[PDB]
Swiss-Prot record:
<dbReference type="GO" id="GO:0020037">
    <property type="term" value="F:heme binding"/>
</dbReference>
<protein>
    <recommendedName>
        <fullName>Nickel-binding periplasmic protein</fullName>
    </recommendedName>
</protein>
<dbReference type="InterPro" id="IPR000914">
    <property type="entry name" value="SBP_5_dom"/>
</dbReference>
<dbReference type="GO" id="GO:0051540">
    <property type="term" value="F:metal cluster binding"/>
</dbReference>
<keyword id="KW-0813">Transport</keyword>
<dbReference type="GO" id="GO:0015675">
    <property type="term" value="P:nickel cation transport"/>
</dbReference>
<dbReference type="GO" id="GO:0016020">
    <property type="term" value="C:membrane"/>
</dbReference>
<dbReference type="GO" id="GO:0098716">
    <property type="term" value="P:nickel cation import across plasma membrane"/>
</dbReference>
<keyword id="KW-0732">Signal</keyword>
<comment type="function">
    <text>Involved in a nickel transport system, probably represents the nickel binder.</text>
</comment>
<comment type="similarity">
    <text>Belongs to the bacterial solute-binding protein 5 family.</text>
</comment>
<dbReference type="InterPro" id="IPR039424">
    <property type="entry name" value="SBP_5"/>
</dbReference>
<dbReference type="GO" id="GO:0055052">
    <property type="term" value="C:ATP-binding cassette (ABC) transporter complex, substrate-binding subunit-containing"/>
</dbReference>
<dbReference type="GO" id="GO:0050919">
    <property type="term" value="P:negative chemotaxis"/>
</dbReference>
<dbReference type="GO" id="GO:0015833">
    <property type="term" value="P:peptide transport"/>
</dbReference>
<dbReference type="GO" id="GO:0046914">
    <property type="term" value="F:transition metal ion binding"/>
</dbReference>
<dbReference type="Pfam" id="PF00496">
    <property type="entry name" value="SBP_bac_5"/>
</dbReference>
Length: 498
């Protein structure tokens, strides 16, 4: 019991196929599967399964020297055959990985020997190693657990080289993990971790208070923020709030009336009292966001001009673009048509509902009629893929995704960001520059390109940045300080030390 912990997650961890997406949970995939190279807090990668690498002048050709002491948790060796088999299994599903540009860059992968793995690329793709460090999909299952020599159609046992092993999984109840006693690296202090399936935020908070669970770790939706604050004050409990990890924002549809109008999007960026929204819906626990990426994100310190909360300026912009108040209605019209904007969100999510109503109230004050469209997850996702939205809640991806991979993704037609940007005349140019920036090794041209991309996106008011949000922890005191993992979607259980 003293080196075993119980914690919670909103759904099961999934089958833990290392190469597929939802319902697999990334943090669980990272507990079982490892990358060639490991991301660090400081933005670099260090050696991991690969102990060294070289790259051609090219540098389109890469040669990794792997550790020779690693075994999958079932005793089978990790070597360059296994690695290459994994990359093949991922790339037989190439289409599915379209959002990750490394998947389109990989041209060939080949085991030169047990300890040498060669990977060759379409281009001198700068973010190569960071993308290899990601939870998915470039991590390694024992080949012997492939189904008919593929992973794309399912796996057998989810055997990784990772510091944790999936002991047991009860659909809709729990998942139990156990420390890998034959890990190649440092042994975790925790021996057993039990994940209780609890989808309701307030039910999570209760399970903590009653003592049923020892740990909660998540983003701003981990538990009600008012309860979180009450906890921070009670010495019976332990709580933490990290520094911001990523951005929460609306995406505005530049291709759909009335948000197709620059002037309208500029006003919207002046209408919301952000600090009050945070103080009112997020119990004062998050930070205001003025730009797509916080100035602390790499390449993102551009001196971009915030739009402060300024109702009067929002009105003026509206009036000048011809969106005026009829007698005696509170909602602007121009040319027949009322200033009506649909804001869609997952309607079961109380926090999203909560922020939307505030957004709705603030924009009413400047003569914008926002109708709330709260729908189930899938509908929201289909609107995202389709561009069937005026405004949609959205969020950046945290490190190491931010900003390169988030920017990379704007190019993919089925993503909310591509759809929002469709109305821009500059859209092809941006997508071209996103492509160039990812292959640039002139370091000054790289800065210049990100500058152009982010600036164009800022000045077009594609987004309405709301908050830079944080990770948060609630824990039994006996567990000690809980660390944060470099990768925002990972959970560093192996650094927990009672
Ligand atoms: O899924 C990933 O590995 C990472 N995701 C890659 C893209 N996703 C692919 C998919 O989910 O199929 C699709 C996706 C698109 C837009 C928003 C979120 C999404 O998951 C990005 C991500 C990073 C951190 C946290 C959440 C999502
Ligand atoms: O992908 O979450
Ligand atoms: Cl070593
Ligand atoms: Cl170059
Ligand atoms: Fe994803």
């Amino acid at each position: 019991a003293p080196d075993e912990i119980t914690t919670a997650w909103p759904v099961n961890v999934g089958p833990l196929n290392p190469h597929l997406y939802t319902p697999n949970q990334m943090f669980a995939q990272s507990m079982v599967y490892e990358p060639l190279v490991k991301y660090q807090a400081d933005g670099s990668v260090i050696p991991w399964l690969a102990k060294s690498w070289t790259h051609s002048e090219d540098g389109k050709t890469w040669t990794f020297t792997l550790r020779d002491d690693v075994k999958f948790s079932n005793g089978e060796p990790f070597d360059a055959e296994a690695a290459a088999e994994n990359f093949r299994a991922v790339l037989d599903n190439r289409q599915r990985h379209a959002w990750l540009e490394l998947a389109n860059q990989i041209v060939d992968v080949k085991a030169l020997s047990k300890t040498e793995l060669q990977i060759t690329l379409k281009s001198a793709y700068y973010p190569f190693l960071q993308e290899l460090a990601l939870p998915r999909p470039f991590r390694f299952i024992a080949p012997s657990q492939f189904k008919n020599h593929e992973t794309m159609n399912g796996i057998k046992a989810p055997i990784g080289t990772g510091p944790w092993i999936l002991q047991e999984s009860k659909l809709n109840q729990y998942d139990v993990f156990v420390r890998n006693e034959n890990y190649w690296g440092e042994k975790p202090a925790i021996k057993k971790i039990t994940f209780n399936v609890i989808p309701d935020p307030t039910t999570r908070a209760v399970a903590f208070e009653t003592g049923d669970i020892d740990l909660l770790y998540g983003n701003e939706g981990l538990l009600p923020l008012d309860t979180f604050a009450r906890f921070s004050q009670n010495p019976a409990y332990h709580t933490q709030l990290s520094q911001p990890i990523e951005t929460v924002m609306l995406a505005l549809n530049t291709a759909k009336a009335p948000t197709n109008e620059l002037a309208v999007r500029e006003a919207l960026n002046y209408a919301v009292n952000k600090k009050s929204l945070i103080d009112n819906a997020l119990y004062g626990t998050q930070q205001v966001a003025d730009t797509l990426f916080a100035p602390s994100v790499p390449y993102a310190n551009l001196g971009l001009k915030p739009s402060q909360y300024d109702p009067q300026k929002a009105k003026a912009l509206l009036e000048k673009a011809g969106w005026t108040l009829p007698a005696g209605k509170d909602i602007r019209e121009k040319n027949g048509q009322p200033l009506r904007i649909e804001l869609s969100f997952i309607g079961t999510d109380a926090l999203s509902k909560s922020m939307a109503e505030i957004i709705q109230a603030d924009m009413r004050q400047i003569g914008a009629d926002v109708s709330l469209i709260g729908e189930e997850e899938s509908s929201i996702y289909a609107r995202q893929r389709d561009g069937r939205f005026g405004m949609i809640f959205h969020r950046t991806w945290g490190a190491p995704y931010d900003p390169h991979a988030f920017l990379s993704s704007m190019r993919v037609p089925s993503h909310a960001d591509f759809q929002a940007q469709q109305g821009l005349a500059d859209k092809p140019l941006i997508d071209k520059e996103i492509g160039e920036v990812l292959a640039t090794h002139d370091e000054t041209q790289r800065q210049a390109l990100y500058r152009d991309i982010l600036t164009r996106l800022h000045d077009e008011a594609v987004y309405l940045p709301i908050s830079y949000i944080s990770m948060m922890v609630v824990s039994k005191p006996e567990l000690g300080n809980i660390p944060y993992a470099p990768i925002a979607t990972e959970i560093p259980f192996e650094q927990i030390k009672p």
